[PDB]
Design a protein around this ligand. Structure first.
Ligand code: HEM
Ligand code: HEM
Ligand SMILES: Cc1cc(N)nc(CCc2cncc(N3CCN(C)CC3)c2)c1
Ligand SMILES: Cc1cc(N)nc(CCc2cncc(N3CCN(C)CC3)c2)c1
Ligand SMILES: C[C@H](O)[C@H](O)[C@H]1CNc2nc(N)[nH]c(=O)c2N1
Ligand SMILES: C[C@H](O)[C@H](O)[C@H]1CNc2nc(N)[nH]c(=O)c2N1
Ligand SMILES: [Zn+2]
Lengths: 405, 404
């Protein structure tokens, strides 16, 4: 009946329609001819204004004052501002609403049940790389909270017409060095080879461990990036052990507590915040399956399977599945032991299902990228697998941005 | 223009140029992607253009494009459509068409095998009774005492103003699902509706968890007829576990032959509403989806208790542990019974080989990432890290409405 995507859950047999996608002002990569949903990565004052008006409309709706005197006055204020300067500025509460809505709108994020609980640090007064470092350290301290993790975003000044960007060169605030070896192999995290080599070019004295924490390359406008070593006590790490396999601890594996994405662009009302690092807490599969078992990452699956004495010479022994499970268990157990917030893929996906129901009632839908939402192990054992999802771009949004170099 | 397709594990990049040969729209639009949806929401120059396209594919396949045999065949098809509103395929064209349809099936991880398909031409079928004979021979051939062989049997095409030949069952082998009035379901909950149709049409029900259903076969514009499959035709594999001796006591089993029977085969604009096809199982289909899905046999918690796992909390990964054991039991039992099966690692490795073969042969391969990536241990397989492009090529298998 309804002229909107019909969405089905195959476990429960329930149907919803997504009307929210009607609100999308930006095209994704798919066409009637071919779907490109699996691909990881596929102003004019008039353009700014319509985007700004849309956002201001969203803001006043969220506080139930659409059509009010203050709404019309803010609209007029923004138009005038853009008319004279080419850009405009957000009120503080507008920035808070926008950062939250950006998270709420992120189709690839399974942790959105928490979207309303986001501490927004306004750092739009920052004027140097040293100062970015102070704000980032404060962020890490607040967000880590000795293991009782709290979601947070720090927002640095927006892109300015005829001025260089604030940029954090690292993809995350915490990253392990990846050292290319003479034999062609990599020691540490191969995901971080390029950033490691950039840190070295910029004057970092490199270690040679598998778990060397990288320094931050921080770039204030129209300046070369400066290098900052995070004080070790600020970086909470968790040594990995297994509840029953006593030898697992002898592997010397570990991971850091705080997942803090630092290279993404936060777009609100046409304004672009090129440095706006945000953090939450880990879902256990990100560490145990992806970071530790991806072939192009630490790739420890074989090492663990050999320690567990599995038949690694045949696929049908399911040695990969067995080792991956014990590695995930080790991550969960070790985080719980060290009293550091973490969520397993079952608890996380159940909570995302609750989020979908919440959003269905609040907004008539929820943009969700199925391939990213379904966990990388045990997919169909979690409820999201059986949930059809509609993917589309709403704004405010977090977006990819080209690397500064 | 053409999509840049990247493998994230290897760093390699291809360009899909095959997608431009798509003449059929999928469900996505630039505003929103609907790739995770299971089913679709919903003159004679049209037919002729699809007919000519297919005949062009066929003669190109035998390296005879432009030849007189080619030109004469296009005239035959055109003459027949102009006069009758339709046309018929030659057997060899049908064999080609069925293979291309499997080849083009974006949800199928087993396409490395596409060129090896036994095609039974059953277009001289005039009755439900005859359909049953063809189906029995298909099952006999395909099962081959456990040395499974891919096969398809093709029944008469749809014709204007005449009911379709249909097999009402979604698969040739299906376990009954009996809805007990105590809310629950005995047997396979996926098959409640079909089990009920069978009863209504006069089948005497069982009361077991693995009662093999009769086939409901429909010749055009007639009520469907009921046919019990000879038990000796339906090979089944008792499930046991190599190291957990208690597992066999669960009384679990599954059938050998996965034979889909309710899909439409479209070739050159002609539609074949009954064209059951079978290959062999990938172990996760049985172990993970059929036995562990919550809305199927849902045995996870049973196995976990028997493994004495901490069921209290998700963080113990009891589900993940029990699921691995069940999949292992499936592989072990099929291997012991000498019945063909493939695990999800071997299957996805062979699929990557297939993507590479197809890239060279056709400049692309339609693949539905959500279906290709196995339901457990996704990122542990190479396909997880492979970007894929989904689109509809013809010949194709399609969904069609249930005939009731
Ligand atoms: C609070 C706990 C959180 C959890 C458990 C969580 C979980 C996840 C996971 C598992 C992913 C997939 C990433 C991958 O596999 O590569 C993801 C992506 C993402 N998350 Fe969340 N997240 C949380 C908090 C946040 C916060 C606070 C923000 C921003 C305010 C956020 C924004 C995003 C965005 C923009 C992506 C997509 C980035 C990409 O394309 O890789 N998340 N999240
Ligand atoms: C030879 C061994 C084969 C294997 C291991 C295999 C494997 C699979 C798997 C795992 C799926 C996903 C279905 C699901 O998730 O439930 C699938 C789907 C499919 N297969 Fe294959 N297959 C094989 C042979 C064949 C053959 C012979 C044909 C046709 C001639 C075929 C056509 C299809 C089609 C059309 C689908 C999509 C089903 C749907 O949309 O519901 N397959 N296959
Ligand atoms: C706040 C947050 C919490 C969490 N548990 N996971 C994440 C995602 C981490 C993550 C993993 N892989 C890739 C990315 N993105 C980062 C942005 N980058 C531009 C692309 C890769 C991000 C973020
Ligand atoms: C040839 C073949 C081999 C194999 N191992 N699995 C299959 C998939 C069986 C299968 C699983 N789930 C769903 C479907 N379809 C059947 C067609 N039906 C219309 C929808 C559900 C089919 C087919
Ligand atoms: C090719 C494929 O899109 C790619 O490997 C995706 C799949 N799903 C994912 N899902 C999450 N959560 N994170 C990822 O990095 C990916 N990678
Ligand atoms: C909603 C979601 O698309 C649905 O559960 C899909 C996901 N991927 C799948 N993949 C395969 N191979 N088979 C399936 O039935 C499904 N189901
Ligand atoms: Zn799509």
């Amino acid at each position: 009946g309804p002229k909107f995507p019909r969405v089905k859950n195959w476990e429960l047999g329930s149907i919803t329609y997504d009307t929210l996608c009607a609100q999308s002002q930006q095209d994704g990569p798919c066409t009637p001819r071919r779907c490109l949903g699996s691909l990881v990565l596929p102003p004019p004052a008039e353009q700014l204004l319509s985007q700004a008006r849309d956002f201001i409309n969203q803001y006043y709706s969220s506080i139930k004052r659409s059509g009010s005197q203050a709404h019309e006055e803010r609209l007029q204020e923004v138009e005038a501002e853009v008319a004279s300067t080419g850009t405009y500025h957000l009120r503080e509460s507008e920035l808070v609403f926008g950062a939250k809505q950006a998270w709420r709108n992120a189709p690839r994020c399974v942790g959105r049940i928490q979207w309303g609980k986001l501490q927004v640090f306004d750092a739009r007064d920052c004027s140097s790389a040293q100062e970015m470092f102070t704000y980032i350290c404060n962020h890490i301290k607040y967000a880590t909270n000795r293991g009782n993790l709290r979601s947070a975003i720090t927002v640095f000044p927006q892109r300015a017409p005829g001025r260089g960007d604030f940029r954090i060169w690292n993809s995350q605030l915490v990253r392990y060095a990846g050292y290319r070896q003479q034999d062609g192999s990599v020691r540490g995290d191969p995901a971080n080879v390029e950033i490691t080599e950039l840190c070295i070019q910029h004057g970092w004295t490199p270690g040679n461990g598998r778990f060397d924490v990288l320094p931050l390359l921080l770039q204030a406008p129209d300046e070369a990036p400066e290098l900052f070593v995070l004080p070790p006590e600020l970086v909470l790490e968790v040594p990995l052990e297994h509840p029953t396999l006593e030898w697992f601890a002898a592997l010397g594996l570990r991971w850091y507590a705080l997942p803090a994405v630092s290279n993404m662009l936060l777009e609100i009302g046409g304004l672009e915040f090129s440095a706006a690092p945000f953090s939450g807490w880990y879902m256990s599969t990100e560490i145990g399956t992806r970071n530790l078992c991806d072939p192009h990452r630490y790739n420890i699956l074989e090492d663990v399977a050999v320690c567990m004495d599995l038949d690694t010479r045949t696929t049908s022994s399911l040695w990969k599945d067995k080792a991956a499970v014990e590695i995930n268990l080790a991550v969960l157990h070790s985080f719980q032991l060290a009293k550091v917030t973490i969520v397993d893929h079952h608890a996380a996906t159940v909570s995302f299902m609750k989020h979908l129901d919440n959003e269905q009632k609040a907004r008539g839908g929820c943009p969700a990228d199925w391939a990213w939402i379904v966990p990388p192990i045990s997919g169909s054992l979690t409820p999201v697998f059986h949930q059809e999802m509609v993917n589309y771009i709403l704004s405010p949004a977090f977006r990819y941005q080209p690397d500064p170099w």
